[PDB]
Amino acid sequence: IVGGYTCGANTVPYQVSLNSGYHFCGGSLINSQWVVSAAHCYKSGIQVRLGEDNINVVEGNEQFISASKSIVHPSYNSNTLNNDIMLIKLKSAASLNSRVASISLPTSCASAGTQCLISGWGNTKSSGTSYPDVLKCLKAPILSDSSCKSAYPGQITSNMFCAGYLEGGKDSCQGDSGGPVVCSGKLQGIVSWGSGCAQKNKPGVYTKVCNYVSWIKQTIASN
Ligand SMILES: NC(=[NH2+])c1ccc2[nH]c(-c3cc([C@@H](CC(=O)[O-])C(=O)[O-])cc(-c4ccccc4N)c3[O-])nc2c1
Ligand SMILES: [Ca+2]
Ligand SMILES: [Cl-]
């Protein structure tokens, strides 16, 4: 997260870290046995880490559970990153409490101007790599579709939205991918891509979760 702030331990109880010997993507707990992340964060050998703050120290509250299966959206396109969403089922359910809780799926899509909270252990520099130990947060508004399309002409599908600041300085970045964009207490986006991080006129592009609710629900129901 570039230009963000330290969240505070466990203030984002739905945030998860996908780990394969190191943190590679974030994700969101949507129920005690399922997580939502981005399809491009897929790989085998994933361990889901819940209740984390400092990812390099066991401070307590952590639950490390292996993924039983990962379901990448069948229509995911790696070249355009359209349908960049993935569901991960956990081998055993997580014990939910105040430090580990699920976030709700939306009923409606959010509007431009909606303010949301983006979090993750991704890079904090736009020029170079500096990864943090604790979770970083950023408050960012959803931009209008015309501003999004003007910034990424021909690359925005109806399953994406932009959120951020056109002046640069604040954005999500590598390592934040797969994590949550929560607005008014509902999971509205998934960190997906962007051009560099926090560059002027190149905002973050997120997966528009509201378009996948029926799919997420049907898929969980049949697995
Ligand atoms: N500016 C943004 N809002 C933004 C948001 C999420 C991003 N995720 C990534 C991202 C970048 C990479 C690098 C890899 C490298 O330079 O070593 C790449 O391919 O350009 C990789 C991933 C990535 C790809 C597969 C699995 C986990 C990952 N973290 C990113 O999400 N960039 C991002 C940029
Ligand atoms: Ca830890
Ligand atoms: Cl266009």
Where are the domains positioned within the chain?
1-12+103-210, 13-102+211-223
Resolution of the coordinates, Å: 1.7
Q: Contact at 8 Å (CB) between 159 and 207? A: yes
Mutate to test the pocket of ligand 1, among 125, 174, 205, 207 (most ligand atoms within 8 A of CB): 174
Report the C-alpha gap between 85 and 125 in whole angstroms: 25
**Residues known to be catalytic:** 40, 84, 177
Rounded to the nearest angstrom, the distance between the alpha carbon of 43 and the centre of ligand 1 is 14
| 146 marked ligand binding residue | no
How many residues would you count in the chain? 223
The method recorded for this entry reads X-ray
Do the domains at 1-12+103-210 and 13-102+211-223 have one common CATH topology?
yes
Q: Contact at 8 Å (CB) between 153 and 135? A: no
Q: Contact at 8 Å (CB) between 1 and 135? A: no
Check pocket membership of 72 for ligand 1, CB cut-off 6 A: no
Long-range contacts of 194-199 (CB under 8 A, 24+ apart): 194/164, 195/152, 196/126, 197/2, 197/123, 197/125, 197/126, 197/171, 197/172, 197/173, 198/2, 198/3, 198/126, 198/165, 198/168, 198/169, 198/170, 198/171, 198/173, 199/126, 199/168, 199/171
Q: Contact at 8 Å (CB) between 30 and 105? A: yes
Report the C-alpha gap between 65 and 19 in whole angstroms: 10
> For 14-147, where are the E strands, in sequence order?
15-19, 23-31, 34-37, 47-50, 63-72, 86-90, 115-120, 136-141
Sheet of strand 186-193: strand arrangement? 5-6, 136-141, 115-120, 180-183, 186-193, 204-208, 160-163
- Other beta carbons within 10 angstroms of residue 133's beta carbon come to 12
Report the C-alpha gap between 207 and 184 in whole angstroms: 17
Q: What is the DSSP letter of 2?
A: B
The backbone torsions φ and ψ at residue 116, rounded to the nearest 5 degrees and listed phi first, read: -130, 170
CATH for 1-12+103-210? Answer: 2.40.10.10
Q: Contact at 8 Å (CB) between 172 and 20? A: no
Q: Contact at 8 Å (CB) between 178 and 26? A: yes
Check pocket membership of 31 for ligand 1, CB cut-off 6 A: no
Closest CA to 201 of 136, 130, 152, 159: 152
Report the C-alpha gap between 205 and 136 in whole angstroms: 18
According to CATH, the topology of domain 13-102+211-223 is: Thrombin, subunit H (2.40.10)
Dig out the tokens for 135 from the structure: 């979770």
- Give the atom of ligand 1 at the shortest distance from the alpha carbon of 42: 26
Report the C-alpha gap between 1 and 136 in whole angstroms: 6
Contacting residues for 156 by C-beta, under 8 A, at least 6 apart: 145, 148, 149, 162, 205
Closest CA to 168 of 202, 194, 139: 202
